[PDB]
Amino acid sequence: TLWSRVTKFGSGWGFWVSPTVFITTTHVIPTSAKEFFGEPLTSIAIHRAGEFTLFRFSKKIRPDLTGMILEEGCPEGTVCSVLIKRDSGELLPLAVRMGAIASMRIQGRLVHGQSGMLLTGANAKGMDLGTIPGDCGAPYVYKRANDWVVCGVHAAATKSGNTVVCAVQASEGETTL
Amino acid sequence: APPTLWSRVTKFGSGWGFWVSPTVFITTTHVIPTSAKEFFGEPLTSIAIHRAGEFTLFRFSKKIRPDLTGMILEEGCPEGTVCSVLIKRDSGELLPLAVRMGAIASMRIQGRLVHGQSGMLLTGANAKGMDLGTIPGDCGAPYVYKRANDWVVCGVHAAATKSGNTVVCAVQASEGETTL
Numbered sequence: 001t002l003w004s005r006v007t008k009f010g011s012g013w014g015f016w017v018s019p020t021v022f023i024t025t026t027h028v029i030p031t032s033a034k035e036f037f038g039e040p041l042t043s044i045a046i047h048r049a050g051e052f053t054l055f056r057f058s059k060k061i062r063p064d065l066t067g068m069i070l071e072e073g074c075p076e077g078t079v080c081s082v083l084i085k086r087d088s089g090e091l092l093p094l095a096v097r098m099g100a101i102a103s104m105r106i107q108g109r110l111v112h113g114q115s116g117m118l119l120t121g122a123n124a125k126g127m128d129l130g131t132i133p134g135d136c137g138a139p140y141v142y143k144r145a146n147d148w149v150v151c152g153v154h155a156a157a158t159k160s161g162n163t164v165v166c167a168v169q170a171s172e173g174e175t176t177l
Numbered sequence: 178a179p180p181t182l183w184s185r186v187t188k189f190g191s192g193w194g195f196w197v198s199p200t201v202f203i204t205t206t207h208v209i210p211t212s213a214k215e216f217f218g219e220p221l222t223s224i225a226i227h228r229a230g231e232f233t234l235f236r237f238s239k240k241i242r243p244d245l246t247g248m249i250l251e252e253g254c255p256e257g258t259v260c261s262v263l264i265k266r267d268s269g270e271l272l273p274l275a276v277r278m279g280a281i282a283s284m285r286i287q288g289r290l291v292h293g294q295s296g297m298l299l300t301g302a303n304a305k306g307m308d309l310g311t312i313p314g315d316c317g318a319p320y321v322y323k324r325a326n327d328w329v330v331c332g333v334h335a336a337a338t339k340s341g342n343t344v345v346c347a348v349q350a351s352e353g354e355t356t357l
């Protein structure tokens with residue numbers, strides 16, 4: 001059911017944490033939008049923290065979903081899965097061994113995130129073994145005990161290596177877009 | 178993966194099969210329909226069957242999939258190769274599951290002798306489940322990888338551990354039976 005939460009959004013994707021909470025990477029958000037999912041901006045509580053943006057709606061947009069745990073990154077060494085959905089209809093889950101949470105500057109943008117190494121390896125070639133432009137917003141998830149946890153959204157990666165970066169939520173964040 | 182590559186993955190018996198070329202179809206022996214009189218409209222007497230354990234190749238005498246080019250089929254791949262298992266599910270989902278291949282070996286699975294290659298799924302910490310790993314119904318799915326500018330198929334899905342993190346694809350062998 002995890003895949004059902006990954007939604008196409010703007011130039012990337014977003015993830016439904018619950019019926020009222022949607023997270024995504026700031027960069028991919030549709031520009032000058034008057035509303036989202038039929039809901040007027042004034043009825044949405046937007047939390048924009050750098051490259052991590054969270055939308056909290058007044059009503060249930062995805063009432064078919066249960067509420068998941070959202071945390072600010074994960075312990076270093078955790079092996080997560082980045083749930084990459086493609087317009088081709090392909091669902092591409094990729095294991096990533098997470099590194100440290102750190103402030104970063106990626107192509108002119110300040111990114112509070114966590115780097116990770118794709119298990120497909122540095123020698124891995126092909127879009128089916130790594131992330132590519134258009135994949136931002138994809139969720140980084142993992143299971144702790146009996147609970148599923150989402151700890152970030154895809155923000156960047158090296159062009160020829162196996163290093164990726166997911167933006168992570170922060171306490172401070174703007175209220176507008 | 179390219180749309181034409183996915184188009185080669187075909188529902189077959191209790192699983193799937195893969196069109197290597199317009200005249201060659203491969204699958205896992207276990208999923209082959211029982212008591213079949215023909216395949217794709219061709220009577221058995223017109224098909225050259227090569228059944229090598231859990232790997233079966235069908236060669237037809239007319240182009241069944243003329244829209245396709247011929248691909249390279251090899252007996253497994255080098256240990257360490259990262260392949261993608263082209264999994265199709267009944268609801269239209271396409272899941273190219275990454276797998277780091279291990280060694281080729283003669284295995285004994287549920288009493289069956291399976292000449293195959295094991296591999297570690299690279300989808301998550303525990304590929305247990307339908308969203309991250311393989312499940313019953315997926316046998317026959319091709320294990321492929323790109324070498325330079327050529328897509329190569331090196332096996333067909335045959336098994337997985339209970340946790341689901343380790344998988345096995347049946348691989349072709351030079352010797353095989355000519356019957357079902």
Ligand SMILES: *[C@@H](CC(=O)O)[C@H](CCC(N)=O)NC(=O)[C@H](CC(C)C)NC(=O)[C@H](CCC(N)=O)NC(=O)[C@H](Cc1ccccc1)NC(=O)[C@H](CCC(=O)O)NC(C)=O
Nearest residue numbers: 027106107115131132133134136155156157158159163164
């Ligand atoms: C999603 C948004 C979009 O499509 O615009 C997209 C996903 C890219 C991917 N390949 O998964 N993100 C980007 O494109 C992002 C910009 C947005 C606005 C945040 N840029 C990157 O991810 C670029 C690669 C773009 C591309 N053509 O694929 N990556 C970097 O700049 C990378 C950042 C990084 C990655 C891992 C760890 C730390 C930092 N930096 C490098 O590749 C550097 C560049 C040279 C340098 O300054 O050192 N090179 C090396 C070897 O690290």
Ligand SMILES: *[C@@H](CC(=O)O)[C@H](CCC(N)=O)NC(=O)[C@H](CC(C)C)NC(=O)[C@H](CCC(N)=O)NC(=O)[C@H](Cc1ccccc1)NC(=O)[C@H](CCC(=O)O)NC(C)=O
Nearest residue numbers: 286287289311312313314316335336337338339343344345
């Ligand atoms: C496709 C055909 C079908 O649907 O019947 C299907 C795909 C399974 C999947 N989940 O991807 N294949 C099978 O079901 C296949 C049929 C055999 C080849 C006749 N069997 C298995 O995949 C079983 C499923 C066990 C289960 N989940 O209950 N897997 C094994 O038997 C597994 C094979 C293996 C894989 C990797 C490395 C080594 C061995 N073996 C085990 O789990 C063994 C069994 C020991 C025993 O039989 O007593 N146990 C351990 C701990 O390794």
